[PDB]
């Protein structure tokens, strides 16, 4: 009955082709023809943190807008205070193979990842004065790429094994398991009010999972190569994409189909990653180009430029706040705008 | 800058120098990738992630083996050298190694990285020609057509087996010579799963690469 | 953690003195170390200050010249070297373990002291010597000489409770942080120059002398004491 099966596939994606169509009544675009264009948009390089040897993979915000964690291929896990330059944590790592890093929005944990194919979680808030492991969630057949704290206890890991994990860090195992990507899952990014989160792989393709439930709710389809980085609208109905393809995609989970499409005939290199402005008004994506485009959201039109490094823009963030953005690169340099 | 401030800075300055010590101390390692299939043998060529170390010389050597993508082959664009191990005793998934071979020389991300080619298990091989039973032109059609060019070890040379050894040697050669630019090499050698040279080939394959950096960095060549 | 001091006794004046401290259960070298004296029924006094690896060493006025601070960290040890001792220098002391980073609680633990008997600075003050109270909310105020207010935001003021026959431990930290391992119920507030700890439904194990510190600038100073008593 397999292909029976696979006719009725067909049909139905010919059925939410069509529903996706029918919603289509006009583009962002017509609707923000109206709007006043942001303008140029010039960003200083407020500090730059030194002290790393190594290729910067991730950096993580904390919640008070001040302390960032930054992960190195040199195995350290690097927290600063980013007002003084102050390196206030320097965490060596059994695996100096590292992907992603987290920030508990409570403080008091970071995470790591990579190659190891475990998720270590580290103690920072703790007598006798030093950092220690407190926790190594394994489980994942492949390397991990992103991790997302929901409090002390819950974290969600995405793996190049195609799977997502909810992990219980008390406990050790993975309370949730969420399948359905084709290939490696690259970007992860939890929802506001943490109960739904988007995931981007190496399928094209981005879903939007229910924590609580489970389940994949939506599949978005859009790009024609690798989803490396993947963001939340301020609000929590849409969402942005960066692929290989050298575009950065917003769709909306409402009307279940992309919205707009971020593009120039100048740029044929991969997106390493996006990001939202508190206002959600702009759009900060990381280039292969050695530097970051700051995109009007609404108007699909470059507002600026920020071209400070020397080599491949691994990551960046907002702070919750958004006084700040923090771009780190393959230059062992990790830079603060403003 | 308060009282605190200032000790806070103090810890900074004590956290900068443990980072340049460990630098320091990291630096002095040769980092090398190891890729292969599963029947290459990759685990027999010397002696998540698994790691091994060696010495020769005292030069430390650390070979790193991961397990169709590489998504993660970014991670090892820094490595000193990719240790390809290949069974050439296998026809059959001859073709499967040279399109893996093409896919890495020709990954963006190790376009300067240089590759020590291991044509493996070659008493298998001088046993499948030797025994008949198996013949190159079943798969590649151009062994028919290939001659040994003038050169090979005495100690139990037989032609058959040079011409067969050569013609597998040419193929990854020319996937080298193809689109090479001079950027990177290819160090092809044949090896048996018995021999205890391959550390000594690393050690003078890399020494051969950081030569031709140093030519290139320094202004010389 | 522990922090066991040593040495002590009697002496005769002119004489000399090492008092030692062992530190155990926590990762000595990353910690500043403290000695603070108290008189036999005085307040606090704080002594010496040595920087986490022995960059930064720091003496009272009282006490510089004779007395030289070092440490050990292989052997996880504080040394006090006193010399030319005096009458004045008769009293208990205490080790204090202090790291120094963007969030921390420094002065946190307090090592239980070791009796010594011989034969420009922001002046702090406590209101009252003394305030009867189980049950009731109880209001400590302290002022300083100077504003305690920096320029980046902190105010450098902490609340330390000694009880009977105990060393005494921190409260709170920049004037409104809990310490770990209180209870919620201790408050602090303030504007520089005035401040202010709340103590709501006071319990017992709550009975002591409560000293106001300033970690402004050195040499730090603390307050008479305010003693509760039931």
């Known amino acids: 009955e397999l292909d029976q099966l696979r006719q009725e596939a067909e049909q139905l994606k010919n059925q939410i082709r069509d529903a996706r169509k029918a919603c289509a009544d006009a583009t962002l675009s017509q609707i923000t023809n109206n709007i006043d264009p942001v303008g140029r948009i010039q960003m200083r390089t407020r500090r730059t943190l030194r002290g790393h040897l190594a290729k910067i993979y991730a950096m993580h915000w904390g919640t008070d807008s001040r302390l960032l964690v930054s992960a190195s291929q040199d195995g350290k896990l690097i927290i600063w205070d980013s007002y003084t330059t102050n390196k206030v944590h320097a965490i060596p790592l059994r695996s100096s193979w590292v992907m992603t890093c987290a920030y508990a929005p409570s403080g008091n944990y970071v995470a790591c990842g990579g190659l190891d194919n475990i998720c270590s979680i580290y103690n920072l808030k703790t007598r006798e004065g030093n950092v220690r492991v407190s926790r190594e969630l394994a489980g994942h057949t492949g390397y991990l790429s992103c991790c997302r704290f929901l409090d002390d206890n819950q974290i969600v890991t995405s793996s190049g094994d195609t799977t997502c994990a909810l992990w219980d860090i008390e406990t050790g195992q993975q309370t949730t398991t969420f399948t359905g990507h084709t290939g490696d899952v690259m970007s992860l990014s939890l929802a506001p009010d943490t109960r739904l989160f988007v995931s981007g792989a190496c399928d094209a393709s981005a879903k939007l999972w229910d924590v609580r439930e489970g389940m994949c709710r939506q599949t978005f389809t859009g790009h024609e190569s690798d989803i490396n980085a993947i963001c939340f609208f301020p609000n929590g109905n849409a969402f942005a994409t960066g692929s290989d393809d050298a575009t950065c995609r917003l769709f909306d989970l409402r009307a279940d189909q992309e919205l707009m499409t971020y593009s120039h005939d100048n740029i044929i290199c991969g997106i390493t990653s996006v990001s939202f402005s508190k206002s959600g008004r702009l759009l900060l994506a990381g280039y292969d180009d050695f530097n970051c485009n700051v995109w009007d959201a609404l108007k699909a039109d470059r507002a600026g430029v920020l071209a400070g490094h020397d080599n491949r823009v691994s990551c960046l963030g907002v702070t919750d706040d958004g006084m700040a953005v923090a771009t780190g690169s393959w230059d062992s340099f990790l830079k603060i705008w403003n | 800058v308060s009282a605190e401030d200032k000790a806070a800075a103090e810890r900074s300055k004590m956290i900068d120098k443990n980072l340049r010590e460990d630098g320091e101390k990291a630096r002095r390692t040769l980092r090398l990738l190891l890729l292969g299939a599963d029947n290459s043998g990759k685990s027999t060529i010397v002696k998540g992630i698994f790691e091994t170390k060696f010495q020769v010389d005292k030069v430390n050597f650390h070979m790193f083996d991961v397990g169709e993508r590489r998504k993660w082959i970014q991670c090892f664009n820094d490595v000193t050298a990719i240790i390809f191990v290949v069974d050439s005793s296998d026809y059959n998934r001859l073709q499967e190694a040279l399109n893996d071979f093409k896919s890495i020389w020709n990954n963006r991300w190790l376009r300067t990285i240089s590759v020590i080619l291991f044509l493996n298990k070659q008493d298998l091989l001088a046993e499948k020609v030797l025994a008949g039973k198996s013949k190159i032109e079943d798969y590649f059609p151009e062994f028919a057509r290939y001659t040994t060019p003038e050169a090979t070890p005495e100690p139990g040379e037989d032609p058959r087996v040079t011409r067969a050894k050569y013609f597998i040697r040419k193929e990854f050669v020319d996937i080298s010579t193809a689109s090479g630019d001079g950027r990177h090499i290819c160090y092809p050698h044949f090896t048996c799963a018995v021999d205890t040279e391959n550390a000594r080939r690393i050690f003078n394959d890399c020494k051969d690469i950081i030569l031709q950096m140093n030519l290139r960095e320094y202004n010389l060549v | 953690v522990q922090l066991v001091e040593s040495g002590g006794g009697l002496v005769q004046p002119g004489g000399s003195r090492k008092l030692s401290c062992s530190a155990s259960?926590?990762?000595?070298?990353?910690?500043?170390m403290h000695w603070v004296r108290q008189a036999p029924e005085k307040g606090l006094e704080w002594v010496a200050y040595?920087?986490?690896?022995?960059?930064?060493?720091y003496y009272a006025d009282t006490v510089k010249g004779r007395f030289t601070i070092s440490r050990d960290d292989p052997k996880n040890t504080l040394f006090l070297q006193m010399t030319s001792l005096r009458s004045e220098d008769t009293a208990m002391y205490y080790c204090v373990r202090s790291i120094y980073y963007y969030g921390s609680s420094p002065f946190d633990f307090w090592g239980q002291g070791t009796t010594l008997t011989v034969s420009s600075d922001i002046v702090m003050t406590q209101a009252t010597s003394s305030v009867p109270v189980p049950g009731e909310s109880v209001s400590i105020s302290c002022r300083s000489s100077?504003?305690?207010?920096?320029?980046?935001?902190?105010?450098?003021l902490y609340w330390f409770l000694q009880r009977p026959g105990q060393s005494p431990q921190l409260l709170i930290y920049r004037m409104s942080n809990l310490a770990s391992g209180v209870p919620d119920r201790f408050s602090g507030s303030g504007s520089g120059t005035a401040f202010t700890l709340t103590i709501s439904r006071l319990e017992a194990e709550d009975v002591g002398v409560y000293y106001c510190m300033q970690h402004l600038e050195y040499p730090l100073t603390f307050g008479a004491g305010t003693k509760l008593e039931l």
């Open positions: 259960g926590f990762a000595f070298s990353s910690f500043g």
């Open positions: 100077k504003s305690l207010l920096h320029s980046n935001g902190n105010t450098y």
């Open positions: 040595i920087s986490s690896g022995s960059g930064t060493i």
